[PDB]
């Protein structure tokens, strides 16, 4: 049968359009399988080690669940319990842990970690996150709006707002390139993807029919777009006091009502991968409210366009469960 | 059939009395079916989230023994991937949260976290401890007495000394009150509970037929007496050199042998939450001996006693198995 | 029939020759039995607690694993949540573990911890690894040792290079001992065993058939043998600028392809518990390399070495999951 | 959990007071369980060897029964089959059955034999009988009381009349003793249990609250009890013709009509294990009968009392299967 | 449905035609099931006690067969463990084994024992034999008869030879009576069943249909039979020199070939209950042919027709036991 | 598939080299089978007939175990209840067992009885002795020497000690020849096996590449030896005072410290098919110390020898059960 099997999933770059859809379709089966209870198990007695080099509560948990769903076992390594590169060489642990586990679930920071930990462990290794790309997430944004809509994939236009040289931007970009899809982004011009990337995805694009669109303006990325996406890029790492410079650099390109209004379009949804920083309700948030007043009603996304029917993030963020099944699924299962 | 399925479990304030003997009963129940080999699991394909803002052993233990028993799959949050409150709002992480897991546990601080946690999750949520109640290890004291017991519960007299201002003295009044039990506090006048909370533990007393006794007098508050609780009072916030006061104030009340002998039952029993300050036998306890060598016997309770057929503090601590598996089975199971 | 039910796994002091061929064969028929797809699960709904005091992902990974695979469950209790003998007892804490799960994994320091551990728990307790013993890898290495060798156990030769006063010296020589193998350890006289405990190797040795031969000179030590063994011998507690001197003592123990060419045996094969320390690929071998450019190489045993035919210790790191099956089965099945 | 796996039982002298009462509860639950139609097999599998030196039909059947019951197999090896100590040692015997059965239970007359079988079989060993003690027996006993009873076990009295100086009186004593209840022995001075045996109950009950009266006047033994124990004194090796002096001695301490009313107590209850001479319905007790035409209505026990509501010796020989497979299941089971 | 559930196999006499009928039906279709592969277990979980105080390894095995297809467990109890009468009564003996065991079985002498373990027992008492009765035999008969004839019951002819005067003669005429069969019986008048027991057969053929035939002359006995019936009529208690007399009067009434001649029928089948005295290949045969060199080739049956197509006795002994089945299915089963 | 389907145990004379080594690796695989939980049952709802003319418990014991392992039922026929030949032939027996069970084990005294049984019952029947060969012994002596040693079955040497014109050295040597190994009998000349035996078994030895030798001289047939075989030669029939010429006779052969030691082998081990009379433990052996003072040690081996490592005779015993398994499987099993 056409299948994926003992295939990695390192960052969509090598996975065509047809794999891709595959993915997408059997997500949509597996959701509705498991809300009607025809859902069976067929990864019994499959053991999967997950490292977190960084704690990461959602993809976690997706994977948890989706593993356990299946009859499957989990192994969660923590960012203490890790340290790839400091004491023993990736391709020493993964080695070991190929030996033990059945596959391998990697989050980390550089890319190239992901990579050797899939050349060396001889399993199915899985990229929950790195600085370069977001696999997992794309899969399950993809599903959600294609849920969410009445025209098949190729119809789908969408922007992603706010600072898109990351893991991000580059992630949605090239989604979009892979099905066809009309992608937007708004952003300062030095916010964007790499060129480089870029050129490789208009390259995806012309083979998939897409419209990619790089713009600084907002308002005309956002028009007659279905979803509206966005995510925080004001700096964790820096301190609040000196995040005054890219609030204002970055502000314009916030998820308000104005701008959910400017896509022309009643239907328009909302999407954030979360955690989300649309009001002061948190500690941070507070802080940020006082150095800055301005944001003390969001700010990638304001609390109007949060606690609306706009907003879908929720479901999105179910949708990174199902997803993440279907990957273990077609990679692993006895189907 | 009389149920209590989907109901969360906060504080037991809600909880009737027909409720609260119930669930006595199932954990008993389910007790010795577990040690009889006539178990079932009805909890089989439920995934359980358990957040623990603070580590608890006894608790999370607790917690994955039984739904492990029951054919359940946790997740377990530790103190470090969780921060309910600094980066993102309990709003939002019970709706995602509850969209993966079939029941969320939460153990933390302020008991309106849970409560904001069971009102977003729309699965049913439990209290695993805060600072105002402690109703897993209520259920687990009751049970415990009750099986050490040959008087009906309304017929059990119990007395707690020490510092009642807390989780604790709020709790152990409380199911005394809503059971029609004769229950006695022994402590300063200081650290009572708040006149509020008594006030509304008088309120259930009157509708079962229960006697609340809050006194200063210990060698008072346990005469003929069927079980003696305590628990630690010592501050571990407050550093080992400042607690002269706090132990010259709560010394008084400290459970030794003629406390048990003022009882005047030879068939009384103690009871103690743990972990219990009994000896030196700590690193922490072995400099308390020091600053205080009258302390080297032990502090809220003395190794005499601790060490003796009067302690039956290990059978209670398996006893808050048995009784949260009756709240994952009457609040989750097909039954 | 002949069995180790109930038994505890301390040290292998008090394990019979018989009783260790007995677990070797058992973990050979498990891991055939694995691999075959004829493995019956016989640990289903056991639940297992893994005390980890120090971080250990080899053998909490190998312990995981084994249980998953025979149908038993896990609380992974960490270094973070665990601390015995800060504010409890290991007294207290073995007693309500006891009560709760059917067996318990330690891996701490004091080898009187475990002891105590096992003394008051009331179920199986097995030892991880102390500062005195690693009964776990000693099975694990005689298993890979004698896969991959011709000649029975009492044919078998190994040498150990290296600081020998630790539980890994104490260990090589001790399971030698006890199957009447021909075991010789290479280290400068300060880092040899206790003669407290040579002295009780003697005597199983006497028992056995075995020869022990501790020795300063690594080329003696090495000839004709079949395993060449090592293990990290620099000191990470001390800062990298403190390691001159152990460096220019310990190095010439080095296992290098010298050494591997003085065995005079083109079969021989090398091991190594890891993590092994064999290049600068890791960012502490990169510190090392720049204090001791010589060692950029390796340090313990080099890259040469390491990344050759003769490298065997990713069997042998498979080896002890097969290994710690066969004491959870032998210890605690239906069998 | 709390489990007394891999435990022989060669006499309770060394089962503590919470491992009996543990007992009495799977006895009491495994009986439930099989009336109700919720028991579950955990023996499946489990091959036992049921020795019996001197034939047994009630333990015999008891065994068969309840291993039947569970899911086990028995083979049965009878007095012709086996003579252990004539042809070869129990030393030998034990090493090779213990080497193809998983458990021995053994019903001989030497006590030191079952303990020598314990010494060397390597699996659990049960003593059938002996002429020290009959373990199996008093679990029956006490849980019939116990179930015949309103009072907690600590407040129950019983009284044994007839020659205690045997497996009976030894045994009805002891377990009175390390449960602290009432128990009672009326019979001649010559006839008690020896003095350093009444010693070491008189240590066990000084710790559990028993109270141990040994007295020659059986009105005064039966006062306010609430059950009345006996057995057959008659010496059945003894020819009938010789049992005049016998007879003449104990007497006196046969149960009728009158001892029961002496007790004083409407509730009061009769027991005996069995056989009875209540009559001359039999063989032997046609001859009695003749030499002694006064034992024609009953010897130890009259057939008014034994044809009677005070009677629940029936009852008792059930609870004799229901207490074996506690043992079986406690020892054995995989719970 | 139709059934005989809970109902006890004492003699036959208080069975209808419609229950001995629904019987051989049953027991034809239990064989065929067993044969062809479709029997289902319907005694799972029963256990049942087999008394023989007579040593019969026919019977023995027919019920422990037909209990081990059906899942149930059997235990054995030999002459030896057995002596019902001696020490203990049957009405003592029942009340014990009615409260472990689901049915019993007993073979034995006397009927009385027989009916009072059933009056006492609380559960299916099952006669294996007695003196005046041997029901399974009959079925077992009847059965034969009936799948090696092309007739109805009502339409087969029988005789039976030799000795009637005792269970085989009672019991042959019996089921003849019941099922309106011809049979006849030829023996010396001294021989014959009991006129009292006559009258009742006389009793139920009125009422079947039947006719009875008693008469000394055996060619006239066996005219146009279609079956021919024998046991063994030589007293093995009295000594082989005192049966001169016994063998001149039961020699005419010999199954020899000339005799099957006499029945004028070649489809005339032979049938003996076994053992069978056919020659001198006994021990006991070779002492008969030494002091009567006559018998040295068969007493009631002789070779030649015991070693012909005639004899049907095999398939006899192996409808023993699918008749004994449909005996404890009807009365023990689910179904 | 190689099958032995429907065969007969009865000499082993008339099975292959082949067939015993597929015999020997199947005893191996399902022992290893057993221990490593992984045995599946293929004899379910097979009834097994067990006739023992003459006690024997471990054969018994072995053939009841082996086939309960593989879920099949067995009917135990003591010798009380066995007498073929007195009252009925064993053609007679046979074709009635035959028709009720799936294979008849026989245990007696005739060789010819055997064959007998195997002639007319209809369905494999086995050998568990006769006087003239004990086939289940010889498959479990060469697997215990099989695996107690480093060479393949050719290359094992082997001497038997004491009176070999019997069963056991019959056995011995025929099963010797078989499987082309180095056998060598030590015993008087006139205690050596029929010369006509020994032609046949040298017939055997040719196809092989057998070595049969027979010598009186025991130091001789003990030299570079593997193992040392021996078995009661003393005459349990004759009163113990007539045992004096015999013990005289062959009290060289005995196995002692000295006759290990002249096997010039470190690792000889010492066989006993048991029971043994290595001491004066026993009521027999007491009696023997008596008459003769000397024999108070041992008779055929001595304790020294027997209560050392160098006794495999319980390994030995327990491969009776592992052996016989593999005859009911190879036989009668659905694979």
Chains 1, 2, 3, 4, 5, 6 share one sequence.
Request: proline letters at 4%; one cysteine or more; a negative charge.
């Amino acid at each position: 049968a056409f299948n994926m099997h003992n295939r990695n999933l390192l960052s969509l770059m090598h996975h065509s359009t047809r794999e891709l859809r595959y993915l997408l379709d059997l997500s949509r089966d597996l959701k509705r399988a498991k809300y009607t209870g025809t859902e069976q198990q067929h990864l019994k007695r499959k053991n999967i080690a997950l490292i977190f080099e960084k704690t990461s509560t959602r993809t976690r948990c997706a994977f948890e669940v989706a593993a356990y769903d299946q009859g499957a076992n989990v192994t969660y390594i923590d960012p203490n319990s890790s340290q790839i590169g400091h004491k023993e060489s990736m391709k020493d642990t993964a080695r070991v842990l190929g030996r033990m586990y059945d596959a391998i679930e990697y989050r980390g920071f550089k890319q190239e970690i992901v990579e050797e930990l899939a050349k060396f462990a001889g399993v199915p290794v899985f990229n929950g996150l790195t600085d370069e790309y977001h696999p997992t997430q794309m899969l399950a944004d993809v599903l959600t709006m294609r849920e969410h809509s009445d025209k098949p994939l190729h119809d789908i236009s969408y922007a992603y707002l706010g600072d898109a040289r990351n893991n991000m931007g580059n992630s949605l970009l090239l989604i979009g390139a892979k099905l066809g899809m009309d992608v937007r982004i708004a952003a300062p011009k030095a916010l964007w993807p790499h060129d480089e990337f870029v050129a490789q995805c208009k390259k995806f694009a012309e083979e998939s029919g897409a419209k990619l669109t790089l713009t600084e303006d907002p308002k005309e990325a956002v028009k007659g777009v279905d979803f509206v996406h966005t995510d925080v890029w004001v700096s964790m790492g820096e301190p609040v006091e000196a995040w005054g410079e890219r609030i204002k650099e970055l502000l314009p390109y916030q998820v308000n009502m104005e701008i959910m209004k400017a896509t022309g379009n009643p239907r328009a949804k909302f999407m954030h991968c979360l955690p989300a920083f649309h009001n002061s309700e948190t500690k941070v948030g507070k802080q940020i409210a006082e150095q800055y007043p301005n944001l003390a009603n969001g700010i990638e996304v304001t609390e109007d366009v949060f606690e609306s029917p706009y907003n879908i993030a929720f479901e999105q963020a179910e949708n990174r469960m199902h997803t993440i099944k279907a990957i273990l699924v077609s990679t692993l299962a006895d189907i």
